[PDB]
Design a protein around this ligand. Structure first.
Ligand SMILES: *[C@@H]1O[C@H](CO)[C@@H](O[C@@H]2O[C@H](CO)[C@@H](O)[C@H](O)[C@H]2NC(C)=O)[C@H](O)[C@H]1NC(C)=O
Ligand SMILES: *[C@@H]1O[C@H](CO)[C@@H](O[C@@H]2O[C@H](CO)[C@@H](O)[C@H](O)[C@H]2NC(C)=O)[C@H](O)[C@H]1NC(C)=O
Ligand SMILES: OCC[C@H]1C[C@@H]1c1cncc(OC[C@@H]2CCN2)c1
Ligand SMILES: OCC[C@H]1C[C@@H]1c1cncc(OC[C@@H]2CCN2)c1
Ligand SMILES: OCC[C@H]1C[C@@H]1c1cncc(OC[C@@H]2CCN2)c1
Ligand SMILES: OCC[C@H]1C[C@@H]1c1cncc(OC[C@@H]2CCN2)c1
Ligand SMILES: OCC[C@H]1C[C@@H]1c1cncc(OC[C@@H]2CCN2)c1
Ligand SMILES: *[C@@H]1O[C@H](CO)[C@@H](O)[C@H](O)[C@H]1NC(C)=O
Ligand SMILES: *[C@@H]1O[C@H](CO)[C@@H](O)[C@H](O)[C@H]1NC(C)=O
Ligand SMILES: *[C@@H]1O[C@H](CO)[C@@H](O)[C@H](O)[C@H]1NC(C)=O
Lengths: 211, 211, 211, 211, 211
């Protein structure tokens, strides 16, 4: 039923509307969120040399694939709110504060008009299109670019990240370009800071393209 | 009478103000939304070579024509609400999440200040101007460009798309440029992905222009 | 008295706050809106060749002058509401949905922080600065540009447009540039479309400039 | 006391929250606002030739200094509200609709996150940073640029403007550039328009720089 | 407990919600806010010569680190509010109006989507990424740039600023560029203004890079 589906959304989102979206998505014991992160390359927009040196600015279009469990967005799918999945705006719920650290701008831009899909068991899946602008090295007909992602404020004991389907590389399921990928690897690291306290989880991708 | 027109709109939008705009537009049994889609080209803004390769970024001006039925927005066209149609802002109703997938930016931009028209039988007509920026091949005095459109999170079970007026082509009813058109064809496909389960309707246009 | 003037505005705008700003500005019998339209050129920002052909993109600074009657905004100018006119934001009332159809971008941009003035008889005068970007033909040291304006959704029986002061030309009352104007003509047309039924009013300007 | 300072602000702003920010800032008899206006040049971002002619677009960074009396924002500075001044957001109060008339863009951009200061007598001081883009004449190694400011809708009987400290010149208290200034002049004018009936006050600046 | 954390946030923010974010963060006796400021360079986006002179515009990506005590955001960390710290959006609490004075645009842009952390003793820590655009001198293969920061409206008796960790220099804990740093120093100044009354705290950084 269509009414129940909307009443169900209002039901789940009501917590977030009354207490806000800030803070880890647990009402009971505060646990650890495990984010599944995937990066699917679509195309290169431009590679522009910085000055007359061997660095350059690479602008890419990609799809950022995110998944996590939100304890607050749970229901039992039995009459009449008997659905396995529901569509929700990412601006109406908690979302990981995942940033592109080495962004040449403030951050990557994600299309937040892109809806997320919430399952009965609380598993959120959010797959926004994305624009990424980073500093590359352009030397000997090769453009090598790094991409660095992680939660800004949450440590490993609060937000953790692992590669989707444990593939430590740029995914090519959405690839639509003609460029030759010379190199494609990634890495999960736990990094400590002179500014802060604990370890933080960062996914570091390395991409190299034939120029 | 202008009061009744406004009262009508308010009473129709009551449901959306209470339950939100997310989710398929049905209150009773949840069906399948069928969107009629039309791409009307107006003009080329620019075509810029990417680096010194054979690809380029094409930036276009177009009119995107969309129609579908919204069961929630139905009335009895008899006094004092004898109106055939009513004008609505698309930010007050559900709209299909149709994106330009091969967008070199986050997505195409639609002018969402453009008003939609809704008839008494729940048929919605929305015709927003649009800006489209896609990757083209520029070779042999011809520029070939592709436009890929589809609902982002909805499968063919939920949102289906068909060419408006069975015309599988870029429409030229708003054409205002001086460029020579060499190829113009489109295709409705059903696509599966490794991220997802079911089939997704994508509309793929091919446009080639004399450089 | 300043309070009363503020309270008048509140009483006038109460209808729009409660009923919405969509729909023609009549609360009794629904009539036709007659819009007076004036385009006053201020200056040329740039004219840039598109590729290596005869076409170019011209970006203009202008003042768009608009006047219409809003029945909802009328009042009897007797104490304590003895004001001949009042200033209001155009985001708080109905405004005609007039677009620059042949814009190379989504549309022209009007400055909507610019206040409108409303007279006690309901006449609205709104004169927002505007940026317009169109395709031009640059050939033989002459740049020829067109501007095409119209209500997007309302036909001639709903929203009519006429040149302000019956001057079928780009107005030069705000002109402050050094360019030599070589041609300056305009025409009001009633245009029929494929997608739609009735006739739509379009104001079409031709402006030629010494390159 | 910190608490009382916030209560006072809430109490002062209550009038604008109920009645709105539109309209001259008087609750008793409507008088004349006399805006004190200063333009303080910081630096030149760029001067770029338009086409191959003698005009160019000058983009400047400046501080716009504004001051006026808002009789609605007055209080008596004795306990528990014994403050000589209070900080307020300019988007919470009436501000003069002062535009850069000869902007090449829609208008100058003022930074409206910048707080204003109100003294207990109702005098408002607001000093936002600003970006200004205008037509210049670039000839004989001199760049001559004009700046024209005024209230868009209010005549001299409603909003007057005078040079801050009666300095008819671009002010150099914030000047941080290395450019040679060759002429720095200004004039306050009462201008009569055809669209309108009374006189409007315009501040006109001439600034010439060594190219 | 997760719910208890959200309720704590709602309790802390109620003051700001009922009373507003404007004004120094004290509910009792108004005192001085002492801000710790750190500037961490990440990379150079670009440096573009202005005209054909010895100046240029440098565009930098950095991390701005701010810390200060907000007396309003204090709680006793005993059950059931036994949390040492909580994340809060910076648009929900007072933040110092610290500006990049010598910005070539309106201001530096800070990523305000970035959450701040508040500890139970009222200490706020906020570390937004930032883009900074300033005037530089490009001479003898050296690009020398200045950065000037301070509170816009608050004097030394209201908002003070000191170098975070007493490091009077640009910090390199986030530095991801390949550029050679020639000069790196900074200085806390107390500056009296002619437009105004008291003394203002400004942080002035000097950075020279190899071209
Ligand atoms: C308020 O609480 C904060 C958070 O603990 C204190 O910040 C600490 O500062 C000390 C001195 O440098 C550091 O050694 C600690 O590591 C900091 N704490 C953390 C967890 O980051 C701050 O000092 C406290 N202020 C007081 C004492 O009132
Ligand atoms: C409202 O109060 C303010 C503050 O007292 C007055 O502004 C000051 O005026 C004195 C004397 O003219 C000057 O020396 C100061 O420079 C002013 N302070 C600032 C920073 O503006 C103001 O004149 C009063 N307004 C009126 C209309 O009397
Ligand atoms: O340790 C006390 C507070 C801790 C949570 C702090 C924080 C706030 N903002 C940014 C932070 O950066 C952590 C690393 C750097 C990028 N992730 C930490
Ligand atoms: O497979 C189960 C969930 C299904 C709804 C999912 C989804 C969420 N976000 C984006 C999606 O993309 C679908 C196709 C690929 C691009 N459109 C799917
Ligand atoms: O008769 C069917 C509805 C009619 C009102 C429709 C409509 C909606 N959006 C845009 C429209 O365009 C009309 C002309 C072309 C641009 N103005 C029409
Ligand atoms: O004649 C009475 C109306 C008067 C207030 C009108 C108005 C509205 N919008 C813009 C206006 O321009 C006035 C001059 C030109 C720019 N300042 C006037
Ligand atoms: O002196 C009385 C008022 C004082 C608070 C004023 C103010 C308002 N806006 C900006 C200001 O600038 C102060 C210096 C210049 C940059 N910081 C001051
Ligand atoms: C929740 O549902 C999704 C898809 O239905 C499934 O992949 C996921 O494992 C489920 N969560 C659990 C652990 O039951
Ligand atoms: C609803 O109305 C429009 C125009 O009145 C028409 O084109 C459409 O087919 C109608 N739908 C049905 C099923 O009657
Ligand atoms: C309404 O009043 C104004 C001010 O006198 C006048 O100029 C305008 O023409 C009037 N409108 C009509 C439609 O008569």
């Amino acid at each position: 039923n269509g009414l129940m589906a909307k009443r169900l959304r209002r039901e789940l989102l009501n917590t977030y509307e009354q207490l806000g979206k800030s803070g880890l998505p647990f009402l009971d014991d505060i646990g650890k969120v495990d984010v599944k992160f995937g990066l699917s390359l679509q195309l290169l927009k431009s590679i522009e040399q910085r000055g007359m040196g061997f660095n350059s600015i690479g602008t890419f279009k990609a799809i950022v694939k995110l998944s996590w469990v939100d304890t607050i967005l749970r229901w039992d799918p039995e009459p009449p709110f008997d659905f396995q999945k529901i569509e929700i705006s990412p601006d109406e719920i908690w979302t990981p504060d995942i940033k592109l650290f080495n962004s040449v701008d403030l951050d990557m831009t994600l299309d937040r008009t892109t809806q997320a899909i919430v399952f009965s068991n609380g598993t959120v899946l959010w797959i926004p299109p994305a624009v990424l602008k980073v500093l590359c090295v352009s030397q000997d007909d090769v453009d090598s670019c790094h991409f660095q992602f992680g939660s800004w404020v949450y440590s490993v004991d609060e937000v953790d990240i692992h590669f989707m389907d444990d593939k430590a590389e740029v995914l090519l399921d959405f690839y639509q370009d003609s460029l030759e990928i010379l190199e494609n690897s990634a890495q999960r690291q736990e990094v400590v800071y002179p500014c802060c306290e604990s370890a933080y989880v960062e996914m570091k991708y390395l991409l190299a393209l034939r120029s």
